[PDB]
Point group: C2
Chain length 127, copies 2
């Protein structure tokens, strides 16, 4: 409804193993070379509210059952949930993602460009 309703624009949900990759994505989204301001990014925390939620789906993310639960909680209620798939084969991708929007990590800037564009698209709908 409004961009100023939530204190953050993007959230990066990741497993303990992909801490470095998640930090690089946060610095990519905020770091650029009717509110007309820059992207306000953060690393996903408990009770942290943001407009868009980026799920950094990696082999380590799928191995952890809690990350798979958090993925289902993010997709529950329209909305902004951007699943980014890096470091794994397309055959190993969760089969649910066939019928929904996802960003492949084999694209430009390791999929960081397409996720940033997806965030920017959603922010236009607000206020």
């Amino acid at each position: 409804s409004s961009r100023w309703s939530k204190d953050y624009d993007v959230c990066v949900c990741h497993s303990e193993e992909d801490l470095v990759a998640a930090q690089d994505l946060v610095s990519y989204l905020e770091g650029s070379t009717t509110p007309g301001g820059a992207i306000v990014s953060e690393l996903c925390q408990a009770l942290s509210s943001s407009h868009c939620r980026v799920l950094l789906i990696t082999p380590g993310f799928l191995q952890d059952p809690w990350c798979k639960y958090q993925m289902l909680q993010a997709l529950t209620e329209e909305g902004c949930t951007i699943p980014l798939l890096s470091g794994l084969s397309r055959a190993a991708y969760p089969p649910e993602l066939r019928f929904m929007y996802y960003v492949d990590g084999r694209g430009p800037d390791g999929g960081f460009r397409q996720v940033k564009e997806a965030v920017m698209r959603y922010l236009q709908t607000l206020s």
Copy 2:
């Protein structure tokens, strides 16, 4: 909000392989040996509205990527979604179900008793 708002009480979501098992569950829920009436059951169809949705999770259900998508759509918005797991080992169960409610098919009446009780529990909250 009201039991009379939706034309059905239960819905049984299943893959093409488990048609017989889904029909047996429908006949179990409706067949009994502030509305105080019997359970109105149906086999899950496109645009079919009901209070509770029973996901008949079997090896065939997990093999089909569409059934896994429909499981995510059912868990999206509180609510009544009863996943029933039959014909598969506990190690083969989807890891998301660790942190949420599910009914094991190894229990009384093949898990049909616990799913019926879960439906009856939810119907008390309505009107």
